[PDB]
Structures are given as C-alpha cells and as structure tokens.
Design a protein around this ligand. Sequence first.
Ligand SMILES: CC(=O)N[C@H]1[C@H]([C@H](O)[C@H](O)CO)O[C@@](OC[C@H]2O[C@@H](O)[C@H](O)[C@@H](O)[C@H]2O)(C(=O)O)C[C@@H]1O
Ligand SMILES: CC(=O)N[C@H]1[C@H]([C@H](O)[C@H](O)CO)O[C@@](O)(C(=O)O)C[C@@H]1O
Ligand SMILES: CC(=O)N[C@H]1[C@H]([C@H](O)[C@H](O)CO)O[C@@](O)(C(=O)O)C[C@@H]1O
Ligand SMILES: [Mg+2]
Ligand SMILES: [Mg+2]
Ligand SMILES: [Mg+2]
Ligand SMILES: [Mg+2]
Ligand SMILES: [Mg+2]
Ligand SMILES: [Mg+2]
Lengths: 257, 258, 248, 258, 250
Amino acid sequence: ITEIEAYLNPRMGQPQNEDFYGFSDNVTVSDDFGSDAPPWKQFPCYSTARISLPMLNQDMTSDTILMWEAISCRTEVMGVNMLTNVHSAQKRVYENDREGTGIGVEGMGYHMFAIGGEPLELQFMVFNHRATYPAEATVIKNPGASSQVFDPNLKGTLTADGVFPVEAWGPDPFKNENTRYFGQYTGGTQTPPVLTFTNTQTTILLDENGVGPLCKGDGLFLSCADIVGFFTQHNKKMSFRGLPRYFRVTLRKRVVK
Amino acid sequence: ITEIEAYLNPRMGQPQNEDFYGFSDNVTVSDDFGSDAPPWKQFPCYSTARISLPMLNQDMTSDTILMWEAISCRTEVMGVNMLTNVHSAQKRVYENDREGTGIGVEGMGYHMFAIGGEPLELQFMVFNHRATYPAEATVIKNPGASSQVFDPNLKGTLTADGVFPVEAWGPDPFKNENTRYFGQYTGGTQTPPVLTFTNTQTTILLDENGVGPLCKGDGLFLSCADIVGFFTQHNKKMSFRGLPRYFRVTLRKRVVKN
Amino acid sequence: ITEIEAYLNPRMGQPQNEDFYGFSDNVTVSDDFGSDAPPWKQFPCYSTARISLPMLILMWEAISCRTEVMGVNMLTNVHSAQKRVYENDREGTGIGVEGMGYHMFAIGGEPLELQFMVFNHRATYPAEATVIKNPGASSQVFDPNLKGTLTADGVFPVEAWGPDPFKNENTRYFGQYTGGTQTPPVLTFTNTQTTILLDENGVGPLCKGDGLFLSCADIVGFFTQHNKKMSFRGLPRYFRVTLRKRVV
Amino acid sequence: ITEIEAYLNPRMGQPQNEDFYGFSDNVTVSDDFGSDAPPWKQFPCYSTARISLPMLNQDMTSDTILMWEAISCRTEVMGVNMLTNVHSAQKRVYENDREGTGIGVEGMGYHMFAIGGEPLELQFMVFNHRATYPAEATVIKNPGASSQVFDPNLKGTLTADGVFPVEAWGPDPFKNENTRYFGQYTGGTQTPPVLTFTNTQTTILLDENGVGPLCKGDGLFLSCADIVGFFTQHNKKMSFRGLPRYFRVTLRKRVVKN
Amino acid sequence: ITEIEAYLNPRMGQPQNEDFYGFSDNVTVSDDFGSDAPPWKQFPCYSTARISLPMLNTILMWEAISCRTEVMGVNMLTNVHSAQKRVYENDREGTGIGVEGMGYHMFAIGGEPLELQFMVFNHRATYPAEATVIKNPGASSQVFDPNLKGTLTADGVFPVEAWGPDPFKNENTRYFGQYTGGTQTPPVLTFTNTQTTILLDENGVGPLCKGDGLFLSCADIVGFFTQHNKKMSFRGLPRYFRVTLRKRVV
Ligand SMILES: CC(=O)N[C@H]1[C@H]([C@H](O)[C@H](O)CO)O[C@@](OC[C@H]2O[C@@H](O)[C@H](O)[C@@H](O)[C@H]2O)(C(=O)O)C[C@@H]1O
Ligand SMILES: CC(=O)N[C@H]1[C@H]([C@H](O)[C@H](O)CO)O[C@@](O)(C(=O)O)C[C@@H]1O
Ligand SMILES: CC(=O)N[C@H]1[C@H]([C@H](O)[C@H](O)CO)O[C@@](O)(C(=O)O)C[C@@H]1O
Ligand SMILES: [Mg+2]
Ligand SMILES: [Mg+2]
Ligand SMILES: [Mg+2]
Ligand SMILES: [Mg+2]
Ligand SMILES: [Mg+2]
Ligand SMILES: [Mg+2]
C-alpha cells in the first residue's frame, strides 16, 4: 500500500497572501431576483487538487493493466482551534453595551469532500436562476428557470480550484461512479458551528463490489468546501469564514481488466 | 440485476419553466378555521412518477409470471449546495440596519420518499377539516371533523404528480404492503435546515420475509416531498422552497405464483 | 401466528365529531398552586383500547409490533388561523405547531399499570377526569400508595399518570418527552421498523382473557391563534402487533 | 438470581410532606463571589440509599467469601408525565398579553445515577470557592481557589441523603472501582427538557473483567440527582424541579477470592 | 498491564493562586484586525503533562493500549446563584443564566509531545510575551501553511486559538476533539466511569512511550461566565486520564 497526504485551503473569496485570506468579502444582498449580481470575492467556491501518483508503466505484454485504487481515507477539518477566538474585531454579545465576548463565527455550515480517480462530476443548481455571476466564476450562463431544480442538461466537472461557486454546483448523483462524495449542510445565521477532529477515524472507499476509486492517468482527485459560518464586524457587515481540510488516502496497485 | 436512475422535481406550487420554479407562491394565513381557503400555488404537493421497466410477460394473469423486485435503493436530495446563497433578495440578519447576510432558507423540513410496485396508498388527514382546497388539488371534499385525526373511510392513492397537497395526505400504514416509505419532519419557521448528501448509502428494501416491492405491470413507483424550509423576502413575505430527489433502484427478476 | 392492526385517536380535550377534534380547548393558567383548577377539555388524557383476539392452557403472546404516528403530513399547514412569523406586520407564514412533544405507547396482555404523579398536588381536576382526589404533597414525587390502572379512554390526564415501573411485568411501554413552548416538533414515520416485545427470558406479553391492551399519548405541540390563545394538538397512532399461540 | 426494586425521591430543597415537595425554594443570586451565600432549600442535593441484601454467612477460615454481585440494572426517571402540565401558576408564553400556556419546566437538566457495593466516592468541586454553604449542607469549609478545579486533597463519600449539594460534589473518577456511575448535564435556562422512559432497557454492570459491583457488608448503594429544570412563577421567581428515579438491580451470589 | 491515573487542570488564563482559578480574565474585544492584542489571562491555553513511567532498560517500551477519560466537576454547572447575569436581569429576578456558549473539548495521549499546526483567526493579532506563538506569522497562517509548526512542550502558554493538532504528524499520539460554537449555546457534558477508548492503530500498536514518558494534553472550555455587568470570561474544567500500558518488545 502507498499513502498520500494533502491539504486543500478554502476559497471563500478574498485573495491568498492578503489580510482576509480565509474569508469572503462582506456580503451584499439584492432587493430582487431580477437585480441579483453577487460581486466576485463575496461568495465561496470549491477547492480541488489533482495529486500525481507514482507512474505505473504499462507493458501491454498481458491482457490487464495496473491502476492505483483508493481503498480508504482519513479527512479532518484543520484549524478548528481558531474558532475559540472571541476577541478579534467581532460584534459583541452585548454590542449596544460595548461589553461581552465577540459572538465568534456562527451561521450556516457546509462541509463536503470528494475523493476520486477523475474530476468530480457536477450538477448545476441555483437558488435564483436570474443571478448574474461574475466573469471570474465558472457557471452555466443564462441557465433558465429549470436550473432552480433538476435539469439533466446542466452538467459540469470540477476542473479548477477557487472558481466554481458552491451556491451554483453540487455533486451529480447520476455520475461519479469513480468518486466518493460526502456532504453536510446546517443552515441558519445564528447556528453554532459543530466540528469534530481526530486522527483515529477511517472512511472505507470500496463500493458495493469491493472496488475503490481507480486513478485514471495516475491522478488522485481531491475536492472540498468547508464553510464554517459567518464573521460579523462591529458595524454588522458579515463575511464567510472557511477552514482548510486534510486528506490521507491509502492506495494499492490493482489489476484491472 | 437491472439498475434504474430517476429524479423527482419538487412541486412547491409555482409553475414549471417560470421564474419561481422550486418555490410556492407567498403564503397567506386565514383569520379563522371557518374562512380558510389556501389559494392554488401557496402550498406544496407530492411528487410522483411511474418508471416503465422492461416488459417481462405476454400476460399479467399467467399461472406464474416474472416480476421486477426492488431489492435496494440509494436516494439523495440534490441541490443542497444552493442553500449557501445568502445574497438573493432575502430579509437580512440586521434588516433594520440594512446590513448582514440574507437569513437564507429556514423553518420546517419535511422529507419523505417511497419506492413501491404500485401507487403509494394514502391516508387523508388535515389540520383543519374546514379548509377549502382549490379545484386544482386532489382532496376528499367535505371530509368532516373526523379528518383532523384518523378516519378509516378517508383513503386515497398517489396517482398524479403535483396535485395531492402534502398537508392533506400521508402514507397509510394500514396498506402499502408493496411499498417502503420513509419520512422525517422537523417543524418551526426559524429552524436551521439540516441536510446530508453522499453517493455511498444503500437502503435495503426487502421485508421481514426477504421480499422487495414487486412491480405490478412492470411499473416502479417513486414518490417524495422535500420541503427544505421558507424563503423570506425583505417585505417579510414567506414561500416554501423545495429540492429535487435522486433515486437509484436495483431490481432483479423474481418468479411469482399468481 | 396472527397479526392485528389498530389505531388510537388522540384525546387532547375537545369532543369527537366537532370542529376542534384533535385539539384541546384554549389553555388557561392559574395564579397560584392553591387556586389551580384546569377546566375539562383544556388538558390531554391517555388513549387506550382492548383488542378482542380469537378465543382460545393457551394464550396469545405478542412477539413484535410496528407503531407509527399518523398524519405527520398535516404539520406542513402554515395557513390555518395561526399567529404569523411577523404578526406585528401581518406577514409571513403561520408559526405552525411548536412546543412540547410527549409520545408514549404501551402494548400489553392486561391494562397498563399507572403511578399517580402531579406537578402541583393542590390542582383540582374536573369531575370528567379519573384522578386520586386530595392526593397530598407526596404525589408531587413518588408515593408507593398512589396507584391506578388505565381502564378507560380519554379520561386519565397525561399530567397526572404515568407508567408504573414497579409493575407492568406483562406490558412493554416506551416514552419520549421534549418540553418547551417554541420547540420545533421532530417526528419520523416509516413502515420498515419492527420492535421486538420479548423480555430477557424470550417471552412476550401474554393476553389475559384473549385481550390485547394498546395505550398511547401523542402530544405534538401547541396551536397558537392570532390572539395568542394556545391549545394542545395531538395525532393518532397506528399499531401492528404479531401474536403466536403459546402453551402456558 | 435475586432482583431488588427501589426508588429515590429528589432532594431539590423544599421539605417533604409540604406543598413544594419536589421543588427548591425560589433561587436568590449574589452580587459578587465574595458575598455569595446560597440559603438552605434554594439548591439541590444528591439522593442516596443503602439497600440491605439477604445476609450471607462468611467462612472466616476460608480464602474465599460470598458476596452479592450486581450484574445488571434498569433505571427510569418517573413522573415525566407531569411535565405536560402548563396550567399550574406558570409564567405564560405571552405574559404581556396575559395569554398562552405556561412556559412549563425549562432550563438545565442534570441526570446522574450510581450503583455500587459501597458509598459513591466524591470529588469536591465548586463554581465559586468563596460561597458559604448553610450549616444543613455537607461541604468542605474554606476549600480555597483549588476547589474551583481539581485538588487531590478535596475528597468525600456520599454517606447521607439530601445534604451533599449537587453544585459542590461529583463522582471521583480516581476511585469508584466498585461503583458504576452515569451522568448527563445540559445547561441553559430556556433549554427544553429531554427525557425518555421505558421498561425495556437493561444496563450491564460487569467491568472489563466480567465482574459487577460486589456488595460490601451485603449493602447495595444507590445514588442519583434528577434536576429536570426550573419552574418560573408569574412574578419571574425561579425554582428547581426534580423527579424521582426507579432502580431494578439483578444480583447473584458470587464466590470471591479473599 | 500497568495503569496510570492523572489529571490536568484547565489553563483558562487566571493563575492558580487567584480567586478566579478555572476562569479567564474578562474578555476585551478589538475594534479592528490591525489593532488586535488579546491581553495575557484573557484567553485559554492548552494543558499538558509528561508522566514518567517505570524505567524498562532486546529493548522494551511502554505501549498505551487503551484509556478512559472524563471531564471532572460537571456537577458545579448546577450553580445558578454565584453573582451571574440573571434570566430577567432588568427585573433583577430569576436564576443566574449559568455557563453558556462554546465548548471546545480535546484530549491527546501519546508517546511524545503533541505535534501542533499554527493557525489563527486574524494573523495580525499580537499575542502577549507570556504566550508561545509564531510571532508575525503572516496572512497564510489564517489557513493551512505547511511551514507553521510547533510541539506542545509547556503547560498553560500555547493559546488554544493559535494551535491545533497537526494531522500531518502525530503518528505516535491519538487525539480527539469536539467544538460547538456560539455564546448562548446550552452546554452538553456527559460523565461515566464505564467507557474505554482503544488506542491501537490499524496495525494493533498503541502509542510507544519514548524515554519512558507518557504525554497527556487537553483543553476543556465549557463556556462563558457572564457577570451582572455583562463582562464575560471563559470557564474550564479539569480532565481525568486512565491509561492502560503493557511492555512491548520493539
Ligand atoms: C387553570 C385554572 O385554574 N384556570 C381557571 C382560569 C384562570 O384562573 C384564568 O384564566 C386566569 O386568568 O379561570 C377560570 O375562570 C375565569 C373567570 O374567573 C372568575 O373568577 C372571574 O370572575 C372571571 O372574570 C373569569 O376570569 C376560567 O374558566 O377561565 C376558571 C379556571 O379554573
Ligand atoms: C446566593 C446569595 O448570596 N443569596 C443572598 C441574597 C442575595 O444577595 C440577594 O437576594 C440579591 O439581591 O440576599 C439575601 O438577603 C436573601 O435574598 O435572602 C441573603 C442570601 O444569602
Ligand atoms: C483584544 C484587544 O485588542 N484588547 C485591547 C482592548 C480593547 O481594544 C478595548 O477594551 C475595546 O474597547 O483595549 C485595551 O486598552 C485594554 O482593555 O486593556 C488593550 C487591549 O489590548
Ligand atoms: Mg449513474
Ligand atoms: Mg396492513
Ligand atoms: Mg416489579
Ligand atoms: Mg462521607
Ligand atoms: Mg482508581
Ligand atoms: Mg503523516
């Protein structure tokens, strides 16, 4: 067996290597579905990376080939510790009284990861089809009313980091034969975040037939989104806060027909 | 072994191919049980479809027949990702300051799916028996006070998509020998929605005797309702929001004695 | 081996075959424990029925059951005469049913055995109800003298009686309570879940006199009118019980 | 095999056989930690009893002795039914409009039980070391700042009913090798109580070596605290409400190395 | 087997000698990320200890095969009389609100110091000289930066909000953590002497105690304490460890 370890940093909207890395810009809200254009930096996008596995040289001297098979993984949200910070420029519990701790991060949690032998296959689906996404984002333009629910025509693949809006794409259950994905959403803008972390939990990646994801072209595809909640400033402006995710994937060389 | 995949779009009330597909119209509330007539489009209805399976028999009456048996399934709520949208015309967290994110979708969750070899068998039951349903809806009319609890006379079958009100019909536990149904309700109007999604979870459909639903007339019947919660506008008008559901059903040919 | 199916309708307080069947009357609240008299119709009572089994030493043994709360679908109604989310602004959905959930069922070969226990011993219950009169301060906790049996539908107040753990050798009972008044109701329903009724010795309830005894209470929460008057709302319960003839 | 059944009534503060049995007196709150003196009756204490088991004759020349071994138990909180009362002199949901139900019992839940062959071994630990407990209570006087966290010298044993304050003593995990204890705390003052009751649940008391509590002196020791939450009067005064606990314990005679 | 029983007291910020041992000092909040300096005593730090095991020295090492751990003093949270903001504070009535808000509960058992990853909410925070941090860590420290490492080598000085367990390392330590956030959240805590956690990895091997040292680490933030004047402080509880060890030929 071979083990790989990798991380994905969150893509909440603000640029890397600058003071708000890990956050979105402050969120603005439209008055109407017909005048809805979320500016670049104000919404989270999916993280993804392709890991290069050791090259498996193919002979074609036999009727079978070798592929790396992902048999199990561990994954952890990292930096959960930082959410014990209730002093950094936060709206206070008694804000009208300039007293108490910061309220910290609260609101919606969206945590999903995927491990596969090819890019994650996506279904386009949006809350408001008339939202105009910015040029920086990868979306289906003029998607139509059908995109507010399931439309079999509206497909994509997660081929780039930090550009596919979380609010416009999710895993396609009609595909992803060669990917395992897991997700949880808890909504509501005052909801406390609930996160666990341990190095003792393994997730088996074998399907009903005892086969894990098979890494096409010796590539292992990792994808995630880890929205922890909102940061609220003293002036009540709110931004997404994300955390990075750790992956440990155990692979074996498998003979494939 | 044959596998089928299918979806059911939600039927929250607003019409298909129009700007509010996936939503109800804005909910209005009566003053009294005696003057309660929820307009068409303001309430959700059940989704359903019959999937045509490969024809097995020249004649459904034969001494012994082959039937498709649903032995297991996977089902997923799709589009959970869209609920990360807190910018689209939503009442804001600090609406008095015109500040903060949108409050997003909050309130009641009603999630139920059924997989069977015939239409889902329903029990009529309502909160207020004096509610007058619109002509578009399939209901028992003049159901009586009995209909606010269990009345063995008040039966139906889910034979049409988008017209059986969720608030008037539920699965009948006295029937559905040939259907498996699963339902979860969390109430409220500011409750956080909690949704999971994975392609790794299988539900076995075999009963206590090791037999799955048997598809009468080579039809597989899928039914659901997936109310995720309410959308609240700046003017405090509220509408149901629903999500579509994915089904994967594994079937095998079974020898059945008639 | 025989299967019976049965239902119990809730007994929340309002009479059958009238417009508020499934609800209590609007709840009134006393000023003091010493002037506390909950009027008839304003509080829930236990539901119970005896199912006659085929006449049969042989006894019917209940080996398993399924039970479901029916009509959960109705709680998606947020239009019927409900206080609104933004009631000041005359806007939003109704708040729907919210608050305490009390869900308990029992399956036995004899009437459910009860312990009398009340929040306030000085409450005067109405003539329609079955209670212990002048029960005394000891009734606010456990008093081994204060016993009863669930012998009638719709008259034993839920707030005055619960299952007696010192008895019920021949009954299985199961209960869950979540309190509050704004609590979100949580309910599940499936036809796929079986509860085994066999005890540690591999024996189910044995039906004395060829009678199967079903009992429940299913308070789902409160209905709140525009004028803020609040009433209990209940739901009916389905039972499927599997029985076998047993040599005793 | 021998079965014993017992109950412990709660010790929330107000005296037995008087109108507020099961409640505390109304809770007062100190202005600062230095001048903190919780009056007797305003706070709950642990319940405990020793059950006398049938006398076992000892062979005083034998390297083995006979002891009762507790192999399993059932325990139930009794009186959960009473919490459906929202009419008895409660602050109302809409107290401003003099309307709605009572708010009922809400706030913190503290549920713990212990079953052992000797008294429950306690660790003294308090929120505020400078609290002066009343003479009726059993505490460590002038315990010092270390008593706000763990201090190995602040030990006791639960040897009396209704006098060891819950807020000053908990089970000692460094001892209790001959006791099994289980506890759950949910805090808050508006939290809904969550309670279950069934006669079908057994807790095995055997340890990693297949040995249950061994009853020293043929005594079985039962302890609990069952704070269900607070009762709020119209005038906003708040008191603890407790419930009694049922125990069924299954014991066997065991020959033990001596 | 040999059994070790040990405790770790919390390090919420107030020193061991002071009347508010178990608490932080009252929390101040900055106006901006660029003017953010949490004063010493206002934030929790990790607890840690090294237990000396019997000298064993074919080389033998102590192997931690299982543990039990319990949060102690849960009983104290039933106190709603000690100078607390009241439920009806404007009416000066009701119980104290008691402890509410975030719970951060993590423990680690290992054969060497817990390996840490530095990560902060706001990289421009200036931590006090008493605290062990990476100074001027830069914007990358708001998410994962593989260069920002440490080891938990001292009790009471590594801020919880600046360090977490490093999943890239800790081959010889088991760690477990649960976080629920908020400031009004109801605390939920359980305690029993009946639950065992197995410390063996996939290969049937527990942590191996290097230099015959067993390393215990934790943080147990139970929530916030709120004064009548609305000043808020962290409250923590101590943790019990029982570790079962066997001699292993390595
Ligand atoms: C639970 C209880 O004790 N309910 C009382 C109820 C309450 O005391 C009342 O709702 C508190 O506001 O009052 C009942 O009497 C109402 C009646 O009381 C008369 O004495 C008074 O003269 C009238 O104005 C009127 O308020 C009631 O029926 O509502 C009795 C009930 O037992
Ligand atoms: C916990 C505590 O210290 N309670 C004390 C209270 C409070 O200080 C006041 O009620 C707050 O205003 O004051 C008393 O006079 C009282 O009311 O009986 C004495 C009591 O010891
Ligand atoms: C976290 C932080 O930066 N706290 C700082 C606070 C706050 O800015 C004010 O209390 C907010 O008004 O101010 C100080 O002067 C103080 O109180 O000692 C210095 C301290 O470093
Ligand atoms: Mg497919
Ligand atoms: Mg039937
Ligand atoms: Mg008995
Ligand atoms: Mg003692
Ligand atoms: Mg010990
Ligand atoms: Mg590593």
